Design a protein around this ligand. Sequence first.
Ligand SMILES: NC(=O)C1=CN([C@@H]2O[C@H](COP(=O)(O)OP(=O)(O)OC[C@H]3O[C@@H](n4cnc5c(N)ncnc54)[C@H](OP(=O)(O)O)[C@@H]3O)[C@@H](O)[C@H]2O)C=CC1
Ligand SMILES: [Zn+2]
Lengths: 86, 125, 208, 297, 460, 96, 115
Amino acid sequence: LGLREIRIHLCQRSPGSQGVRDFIEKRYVELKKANPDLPILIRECSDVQPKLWARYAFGQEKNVSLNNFSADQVTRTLENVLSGKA
Amino acid sequence: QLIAVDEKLDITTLTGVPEEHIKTRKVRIFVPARNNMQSGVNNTKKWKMEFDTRERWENPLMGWSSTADPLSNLVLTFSTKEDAVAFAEKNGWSFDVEERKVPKPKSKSYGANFSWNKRTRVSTK
Amino acid sequence: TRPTIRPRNDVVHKQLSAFGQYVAEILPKYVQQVQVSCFNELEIFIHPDGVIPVLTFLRDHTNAQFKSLADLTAVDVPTRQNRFEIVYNLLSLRFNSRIRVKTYTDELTPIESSVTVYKAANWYEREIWDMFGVFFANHPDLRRILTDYGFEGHPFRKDFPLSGYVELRYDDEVKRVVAEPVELAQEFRKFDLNSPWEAFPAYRQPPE
Amino acid sequence: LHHALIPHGKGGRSSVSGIVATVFGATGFLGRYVVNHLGRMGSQVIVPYRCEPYDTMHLRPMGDLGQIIFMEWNGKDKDSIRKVVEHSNVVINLVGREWETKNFDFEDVFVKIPHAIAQVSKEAGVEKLIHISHLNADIKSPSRYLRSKAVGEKEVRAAFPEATIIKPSDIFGREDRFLNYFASMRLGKETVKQPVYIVDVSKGIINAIKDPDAKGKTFAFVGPNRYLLFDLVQYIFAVAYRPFTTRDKVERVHMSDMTLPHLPGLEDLGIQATPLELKAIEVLRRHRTVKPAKTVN
Amino acid sequence: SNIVVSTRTGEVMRILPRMHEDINEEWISDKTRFAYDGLKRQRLTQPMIRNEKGLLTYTTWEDALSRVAGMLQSFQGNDVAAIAGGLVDAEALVALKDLLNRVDSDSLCTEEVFPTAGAGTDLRSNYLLNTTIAGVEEADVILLVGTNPRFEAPLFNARIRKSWLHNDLKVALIGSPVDLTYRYDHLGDSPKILQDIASGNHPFSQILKEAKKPMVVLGSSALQRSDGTAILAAVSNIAQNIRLSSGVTGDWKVMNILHRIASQVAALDLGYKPGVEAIRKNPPKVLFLLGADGGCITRQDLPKDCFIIYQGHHGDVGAPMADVILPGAAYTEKSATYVNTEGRAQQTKVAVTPPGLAREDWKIIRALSEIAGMTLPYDTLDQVRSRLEEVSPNLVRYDDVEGANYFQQANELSKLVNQQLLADPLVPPQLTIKDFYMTDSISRASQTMAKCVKAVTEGI
Amino acid sequence: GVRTSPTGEKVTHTGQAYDDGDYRRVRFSDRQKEVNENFAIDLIAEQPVSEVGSRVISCDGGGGALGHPRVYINLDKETKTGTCGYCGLQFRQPHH
Amino acid sequence: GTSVKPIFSRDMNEAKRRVRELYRAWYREVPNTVHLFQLDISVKQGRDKVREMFMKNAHVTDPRVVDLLVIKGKMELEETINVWKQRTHIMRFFHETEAPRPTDFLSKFYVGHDP
Ligand SMILES: NC(=O)C1=CN([C@@H]2O[C@H](COP(=O)(O)OP(=O)(O)OC[C@H]3O[C@@H](n4cnc5c(N)ncnc54)[C@H](OP(=O)(O)O)[C@@H]3O)[C@@H](O)[C@H]2O)C=CC1
Ligand SMILES: [Zn+2]
């Protein structure tokens, strides 16, 4: 139940990652303001779906898809992951 | 008179190659780099297929170099990268392809050796 | 052209070019190319479907009578879509001449057997099947002729390794000769002999 | 581990297994199989011989070039033993005679020679020693063979505490003296026999060499099935298609094979014992020109 | 730099440059060329354990792996930690990270320090040479801060020299006045000069304002000096002033970080914590040394009877302090992924196999995980690369250098903490050529490097 | 100039000798180790230095076509002597 | 598309019928091979080996490959029936001298560098 790190794999040019990119360029800083000790890694996919990876204690990982998500949708998904609610 | 079958070509079962020398090897498809000791480029024209390097050990008598993999000296030549990919695919070998490296065109000017105000002026010739 | 250079014969060159054009005119259904080399050797490149007609013509026509089959063999070129090229060498005693016929196939396309045209082809075709894996249709008895019984693979293929995959020894536990995966006390030494600085400008390929 | 003794290759003829083995009694029945097993994986084998080299010629093709080294020795001298085992990391003792000779009685063959081998090997720093005794070796045996076997086993243990003792029953194989001896006769119903295949014993010796935990242990190599002597001989004669060695062998063959459940066997060394019904034809086919015997478990 | 290893009968004979127009053109460094001699000396060949006397003695893989696995099972959480050295590949890095995560440990550290305040390693461009090596040929002004590119990155300095010669590039340096083989403008030694440039008092601020393609390069050696946060903040402030005053010329990517070791960028990509401070805060009782030979952690900084495992290929300062030694493979003996200072991932190929009982490093970690009851999902090199793709998908694109620019976010996050600068001039570690030959365990084992050091120290 | 190992084996001109822990020594038991007694380095070290009154000398190893390829050696350096790259013979100008 | 010249079979069913004919012939021949070569194996394990060698190629979905395999198997059967092979050739199918190779990751780790 203890979150350790999260990973956002977004693509540079594909339209499906568009909203995700927006989220970063709009809100990532504020997120890093609220969570100064959580590693939020941002990495680059290529011709792949956007994805969000969440790592919990003892190496368990869960991933969710971010294809065609808007900034509001990715914000909601990230709040759900951070809070732990299903 | 024509089957008109639609499937990817696979001749693995007909070549007599042992099972573990098909799905365990990794072939490399590449244009060999020019030997830096020389200037000739005639050895950088064709595509090569070569297998992964395996263990070499010392012969207890005479200290020679001994191997146990039969494909250690197998190098194939191809006109294009597509030919090599087709051969490797039909033979059931997993491959890594590297794109051809080409020297970029350079601007050469002998007159720049003797420059009024640039740094290209040479101190000796 | 002083004494170290091979002399050339223009009369034979002209004669072979004329006979090549003649053969191409007579059999346009199968002939794709005709060539005469600088040392006066004529080769005819044909479609695989014309192996039996063309050969029959060259054996039976009054102006050819190539009655002797000197050699039949195959060449493996992995870079081509059709891997194997099949080469027929024919000798005519009536006109004291030689000719070469080439065709092509891959690992899965049968080639017609020419034993009905030349009896000599029989063993040659067996050898081809033994060494390259080319199947010949309507062969009286096609089977291995050079390799050991139960030998796997076709050793004259380019991707076949030089020392093969198995070696033989005598085992005293089972009291017989057994086959095991090959292990060499000294690996064959691969040499990189080709130099840069191309040797022959006349054969330079376009830089594409 | 002395880099020159680090294993290399794929465990084949020209591989290096890291085993330097001195095999005493390599010119006999079990020795040829042991040397073949050692040499097919690329170990270095030192063969001491006292016979003519002609009698050792059949061991030459058993290893790669240089992997089999023949040296002369005699059991009465400790210097030859020392020079034969100087460079080995494992020593195997297969020395044994099934009869008494004017120059070597049972005491020299089974007590003095093994004791000398063990003592010299311990002095030379040999890491592993493997010694073969009999399954039915006990001190109070009516036969001098098994009595000397037991005494020699005790003295080998005294000289080499880390020695591995392998005790086997009658061994049946292509060059044996069990099946061939029973087929050359051309009493029972109370003697029980437990024969073991030769290849099983060879693999057991090899795995004991390779097993790091079989240092001071004692093993008993026995077959899967126990037969009565009468029915075993009946089966032997049936397989040959034919109608149904002074004193010590008779008394040893009339006695029953002991049972030692507390001792580890072939299964502890990862070997499945081959039944006699699979190899009887192989051994006895040369005696010619299905109805297997009843077993007691 | 791309190279060709020449081998014969299972032995490395020499190293030659392999042509890459974007990285090293046609040249290599003297260390790159001649330090292969060190691969033949002080090599780890067999597993080793401590005997009852306290001395390292040989043993089998089974015994050493069982001893390591027993302690891995006994301890967990913050009691387990690992340090990664300068020659470690991405496969072994991700394998060790997964193994320590399976025991609920997050203290995966490197010896090279990068400031973690602000964005840290969350934004890749925060720790990359964003202009790329080739992009130096397009710049018209460059500012070097606290680095000696001549000995830290010889081919990068060669590219700077080429641009200086052919493009009339203007070069200025903050730090000690080293010899760079070209004439540059020394602005001084004090870090406070950056502040002046960040404020606009210094005339070089006007020089940078007029530039069309300005470039600022900061070395990691200036980041190791405990001022790294403040130094990075000042450089980011200068770059932000440039972008704000001169506007957005394009995707020029002014900011740059020049790295020194080959394993740092892959470790930062995979989520390793840069620096070894987390070990100091929470001393562990089981410590993994993955080729770590910088000596930044001694047995004094660890509790009594700490279990130390060294995995590597050379016997150096890291091996004699360890309880268990696991012999790994050198870079010429494996197919491994390394990411250079630009963020470009490249793979090596097997030239020879490891000597003795040495094995591939990720295979060692996987075997250890299986023996310890924590088997990792991957079994082949392809599956390890699939895991690498899952963790950071830029590690499987093997010649790509293009990436996103998140400079604005990093610059906004770098303004939170206000660490002060020290009154201590920037002094690079590679002051002169005699300090260039011996930098890693392979170089220190090289007899040719020893000859070079001797010749430069006294010449004949 | 042959030497002996601390074990007792002869050391070849290439410096080869099995160490004490090497099992391979067993190949020489009841046999011998083939060693060439004439060391070429010591034999070429005994040749006198030839004196020539020229700055450049030529060497072909003696015997004309039975020697080695003909090479030219510069003798301007007085610190050392010129040495043939095939034969090992030495040349010098008459210093003092 | 991709029209190709047949070897013997127009589709998969004819190839399967030829495969079944070849398998029937091998199954009939096995006891004769065991008796005539004086082999030390049983008829049961000989037929098991025949079945295993047939199942090794069970993944092929191309009729040309299938009937080339059938041609090769018929060649092998003709070699066996005419006693052109020796006992060694017949016994080579069983690899009774080759040491067992572990498929486990740990064992391959222990023995060497080969994956
Ligand atoms: N029934 C069986 O086969 C089983 C065997 N036993 C034990 O297993 C061991 C080996 O068995 P096995 O192979 O069948 O026996 P063998 O008779 O076939 O050979 C024994 C070896 O010991 C050598 N040897 C015998 N006497 C002397 C001697 N006085 N000096 C030097 N060498 C000698 C022989 O060499 P050479 O020919 O030159 O004389 C021979 O090579 C023996 O110790 C035996 O007692 C264990 C249970 C039963
Ligand atoms: Zn000379």
